[PDB]
Ligand binder design. Structure first.
Ligand SMILES: Nc1nc2c(ncn2[C@@H]2O[C@H](COP(=O)(O)OP(=O)(O)O)[C@@H](O)[C@H]2O)c(=O)[nH]1
Ligand SMILES: Nc1nc2c(ncn2[C@@H]2O[C@H](COP(=O)(O)OP(=O)(O)O)[C@@H](O)[C@H]2O)c(=O)[nH]1
Ligand SMILES: [Cl-]
Ligand SMILES: [Cl-]
Ligand SMILES: [Cl-]
Ligand SMILES: [Cl-]
Lengths: 175, 175
């Protein structure tokens, strides 16, 4: 790779409650819900980043096809359907719950073996007052050659930037 | 469409017992098992058709990424993972079991609404001595603008031809 595509399959992965549905809602509808429900059925959405909005107009309109595992990450025989053929993996944890970091690390290791993914590790819920050490997390991401970003779905902080960073990386690769 | 791709996601769909795992085994390993087991985990395989083996060498090497639903077609919240982003759908029934035809028709209707698929309706098990009327089935496929083929995983009849027909259709579209 990288072959240029009409859209880029992107797995949105993380333990329940870390804020995946909230990242999608904030991203796509500029809205946040303090209370959320369990997902009914498969969870998909699309999002377009145009990098010029120095980039080649043909390559730099990047469309994400986001698959939110939304609970299916529990099932070892179902989750590969989310990974297969994905260009990007967004692995989310909650800064206030260290257990969710531990699971994210396990997923990063699985993904690195599975295929070549552009992986972004997302520290969500930074608006809250930390069970993790961010510096350790940043070091972790460097050691594993991951993109890293700190976000709040609640305030909107760095939500679009998740996909800006991914799109920059896809372009760099296509180029 | 059609955008040229490094591989073409292909959903292999049909009621249990119609012969999906057998089509894959015959296709990929030139082998048939008279007895088969329930599938453990997600079921994927790849297959390449080279159309020159009058065609443009760049476009005519067609790689299929085959996702066998392998039992998951029962689950309405799981099956969309198989359909989403698929270029082709292979909908298989068993000529000796009309119930499997009725289900295949329901799936064709769902797929036609879901997205633009190249759909091939496969009449498997033709080696057996028919609960269906082939002419009705051929008429059905014409009315719904489907590719149609009669196959035996047991003897190997027309198994490779499923993918020859699909590859011809993908090329026609890319062109
Ligand atoms: N304070 C805060 N709460 C959040 C944030 N993102 C999600 N939540 C809350 O966390 C809970 C779980 O969110 P949800 O989107 O359902 O997580 P998912 O299971 O990973 O999809 C909900 O109560 C959300 O309102 C955030 O960035 N900050
Ligand atoms: N006679 C005959 N038997 C077949 C054929 N294809 C599959 N079978 C048998 O049908 C049964 C179900 O096959 P399988 O591949 O497991 O079907 P699946 O559930 O759709 O994946 C097995 O006993 C196979 O040996 C065929 O073309 N002819
Ligand atoms: Cl909160
Ligand atoms: Cl909700
Ligand atoms: Cl038989
Ligand atoms: Cl088997």
């Amino acid at each position: 790779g990288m072959e240029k595509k009409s859209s880029y399959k992107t797995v949105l992965l993380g333990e329940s409650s870390v804020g995946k549905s909230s990242i999608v809602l904030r991203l796509t509808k500029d809205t946040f819900h303090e209370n959320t429900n369990t997902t009914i059925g498969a969870s998909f959405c699309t999002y377009v980043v145009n990098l010029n909005d120095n980039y080649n107009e043909n390559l730099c309109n990047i469309k994400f096809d986001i698959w939110d595992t939304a609970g299916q990450e529990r099932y070892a025989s179902i989750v590969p359907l989310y990974y297969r053929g994905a260009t990007c993996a967004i692995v989310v944890f909650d800064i206030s719950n260290s257990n969710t970091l531990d699971r994210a690390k396990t997923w990063v290791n699985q993904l690195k073996i599975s295929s070549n993914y552009i992986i972004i590790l997302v520290a969500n819920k930074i608006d809250k007052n930390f069970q993790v050490d961010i510096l350790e997390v940043q070091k972790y991401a460097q050691d594993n050659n991951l993109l890293f970003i700190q976000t709040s779905a609640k305030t909107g902080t760095n939500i679009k930037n998740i996909f800006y960073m991914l799109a920059e990386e896809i372009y760099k690769n296509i180029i």
